[PDB]
Every structure is written in C-alpha cells, then in structure tokens.
Nucleic acid binder design. Structure first.
Length: 53
DNA sequence: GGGTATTCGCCGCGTACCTCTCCTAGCCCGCAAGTATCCTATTCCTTGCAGCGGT
C-alpha cells in the first residue's frame, strides 16, 4: 500500500551503453538527486569509478 | 556351329532325452551433483616512526 507518494519505480532493461549511463546520470543530477551505481566487484571498482568520472 | 570337357555353384548328410549359459554398441541428453568469485561477521599476527623518561 502507500506511503502516499510512492511512484511506480520505472524499470529499463537495456544492453550496456555509455550514452545511456551518461543520460541517466545527467538527468538525475539536473534534478538534484543522487545516483546509485552498483558495480559489485571490489577488485575493479576503483577502475570503474575512475572511468565513470 | 558343335560336340566335347572342364569348372562352378547348389544341395544333401539319424532319433529321443537330460544339464548348463546367454540374447548389441555406442551416443546423447538431461538429471543432478559437485565446484570458482563477492560482501559482512569472525581469529591470525608482524612493522615504522615519534614520544619520552631519565640521566
């Protein structure tokens, strides 16, 4: 049930694309919110974060 | 042509009864059963450099 203003989290299952990631992150940033970017690999998480930067 | 000889291939080789063993190889496909990497707890310790009493 509610909490009242919960909104139907939209699900998109896309093949990986740099443009899609950039567009989503910029859309969230321009909104003022925050993005979770789940990588789930501590070995290469530093490289992944550096590349996303 | 043809009468003859020579070869080649097919057909055939008893009855009755008793004991025993053994009747495809291999592939495939799905079950299912047993394994290498990722986070939050745990027990395992061994160094590096500055304070610091003390004289």
């Amino acid at each position: 049930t509610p909490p009242a203003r919960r909104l139907a989290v939209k699900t998109f299952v896309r093949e990986y694309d740099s443009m899609v990631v950039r567009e989503a992150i910029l859309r969230e940033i321009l909104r003022g919110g925050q993005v979770y970017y789940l990588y789930n690999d501590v070995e290469n998480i530093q490289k992944a974060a550096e590349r996303l930067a």
